[PDB]
Amino acid sequence: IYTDAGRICRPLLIVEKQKLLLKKRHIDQLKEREYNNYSWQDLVASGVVEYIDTLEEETVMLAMTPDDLQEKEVAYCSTYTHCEIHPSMILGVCASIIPFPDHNQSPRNTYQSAMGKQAMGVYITNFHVRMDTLAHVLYYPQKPLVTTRSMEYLRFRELPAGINSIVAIASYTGYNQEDSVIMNRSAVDRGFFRSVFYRSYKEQESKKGFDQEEVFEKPTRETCQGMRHAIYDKLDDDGLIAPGVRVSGDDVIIGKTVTTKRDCSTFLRTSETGIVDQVMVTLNQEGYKFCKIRVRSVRIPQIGDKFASRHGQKGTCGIQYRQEDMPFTCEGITPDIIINPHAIPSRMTIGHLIECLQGKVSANKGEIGDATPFNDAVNVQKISNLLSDYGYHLRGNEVLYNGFTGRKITSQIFIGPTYYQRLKHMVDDKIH
Amino acid sequence: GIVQDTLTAVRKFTKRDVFLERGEVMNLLMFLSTWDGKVPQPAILKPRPLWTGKQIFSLIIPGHINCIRTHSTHPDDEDSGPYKHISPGDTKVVVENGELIMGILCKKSLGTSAGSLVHISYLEMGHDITRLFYSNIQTVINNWLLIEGHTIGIGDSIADSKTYQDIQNTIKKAKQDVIEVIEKAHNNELEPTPGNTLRQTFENQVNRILNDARDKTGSSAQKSLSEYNNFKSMVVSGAKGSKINISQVIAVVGQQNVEGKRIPFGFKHRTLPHFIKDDYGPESRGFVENSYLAGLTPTEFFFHAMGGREGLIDTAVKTAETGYIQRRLI
Amino acid sequence: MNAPPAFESFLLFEGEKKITINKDTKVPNACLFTINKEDHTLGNIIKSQLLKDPQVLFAGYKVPHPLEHKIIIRVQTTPDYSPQEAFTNAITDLISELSLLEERFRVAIKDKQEG
Amino acid sequence: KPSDLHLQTGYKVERHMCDGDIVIFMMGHRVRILPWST
């Protein structure tokens, strides 16, 4: 009997004999969870859900689903004692974003779990007051069109990290060689995957010793100068730059002088040409003057920037063709991303193609599709039979035309909307 | 560098059906750097002037190379019978006099290997000539692929109902065979093969049955891949993925092993709390009997994560050991 | 930074000539017209109109690199016809076709609006 | 420097890498200057 601290456990439905104790009235009372005060704890306390830990879990005889496991048949086990609520609650927070993860190979679920932590998005709603160093905020994030049910609780419809691209899996001009992608330049001009990048610089006016006090003041050619460097003219007279000025590479942000005064001014981190966003002035714990300055830089996707799907492989952008160079459909739907076909097979990510197929059905149907892992009410045949109702090829192929010469492409291209993430990497962070 | 991009494509370009028209041919000859300004005579003059993929490729091939490879799917009963220099499936490559006469190219013919037309080019013609041969293959193939296009989609991963029934019956046979082996062990009719144990006897017998099931499903699937299938396009030119990858995508993921053995008994006498104690059936110890198109059940998903973390750890330890050995040698 | 301004895919800089002709020396009666600040729009129609002349044995175009904005059109005619005239006639016949197309579209419009 | 810009043989002018320079990343390549940032 353990009452220790640190035993990891998890809730499980109780199966007395061979019938769940979760009757229909518990569900009826939980539907009305507001204006009823019937919560989780009124379900625990009703002796219908238990917390089982990892060594109590070896004396139990779990079922995966009531609908199958405790139904009379040619008997496997008939002494079940617990039941899984949903078997997809075995997955963490970053693997609950992957759609159809029971169709990927586990190296891909692991890769994506690692890359869902690099996708830009909106990271928190009050980023307007937070002067973190290094924030990345997408302009137009979108919630996925093919989404897990475990994402309703991760608040991924409210701070989503990515955009639903139209993706064609096609060899177009060779600029999508191994993992590279071809981006639409017109989509990118229309706001696609644009980003903002904020950086904060702090400095404090410390008077540590008796002499040698640091002070904020416009240095340039004022009085008692020292080793004044390139440029000091955007500072205001309090030695701080003002919000709304455009700062370039090797440009001065805070005008600090450490007194016959040396200068210890603050410059931008080796070039970026941003715009000064916010200059807050305060006092630290010591009662010295303190200043945080946030500069803002817009980041339009480029030839180096890395994008990745929710099915775990990331690629730079090889080239960007405008809208008239892209392969179009007989409706004029040019892809947003063209990805290489020879990426898909080697990675077992059929979940990527099922995400495109379910996403096409969801965009046409006006729904948002269920990519929950262990569904069994969602096949590929059921998705195909709905895609063939909106007048498309049931397997998601589509006769594309060549944007350069206008001629059809002899093999029909697989195209559809897939949720793409803009990985935090890019290239603006290397050329400065 | 001849990556998958222009290897699948060169297997499709040199097929016997690739008839290029006059404007397409001129488009392609704009990207030959080593072209002498002469348009070859069409393979087909009447009714329509209509070149071939092997003509434009024989324009790429440098000098007067001679080579005889053998495409990947060559029936081995062909060289003996008639049609030995005819080859109804176009599986014997003969680059004679710098000029592809028959046979579909692949990486077996264009990689670097023994034979390997690019190797014979490096040996016979020179060293910048093979640089040009690489770059020419790439450019004219990229542009023909603008005309032809390559994709991968659902329906490449789907097999006709005949093959689904075949694979389901293969799996069901493997199930009931492991079931009868287990009943032997449980009634002591199993006699240990000389050398190891009775547990290792049972273990080897079961692993044998299950690996035979996985391989039979993989083959019975790849034998149903149509010629219009793009996974066949991927694999027969050896360009991308292994045929085991496509086997798992189409047929069966198969048995998951942690340190060479089936999934270990990690709870007390069972692999997960969902199974009965002392279950040696294939479902209990890690046999994933679904493809990635049908999707893995919750326990198969976990056993697959278990057995695919070994890959991730093996990768890291191998890169470390390999860098060490390389530096020590060097 | 290294972002080419968007207008330099169609705007000639000083000293660019917009077109140069090089005689191709591997074969007789072949020219190579390099046209600056053009793309497949103007290359593909000229090619497909040259391929309509019965005295043109080769017409082709290529965009050497997609990040540079220029095309190369290689023409090769029969000896009694120069590729400069084949090019000129292609452009004249395209201009004539588009003039016809413009007036036919004006008439089709003015009839659709039940004028 | 309107005065210093005269060159006569033997000087070493330290120019900017241009098309055709040979660089190494151990094999070597010929530089071609392209208009974007990778």
């Binding site: 590279s180 090889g318 290239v427 | - | - | -």
Partner: peptide
């Protein structure tokens, strides 16, 4: 000694060339 930039593909270069931005150059 460059700014360790990314490497993207370019099938229009000769296999003996590298494409260098005008800022690395």
């Amino acid at each position: 000694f460059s700014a360790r930039t990314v490497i993207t593909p370019d099938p229009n270069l000769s296999i003996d060339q590298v494409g260098v931005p005008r800022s690395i150059a």
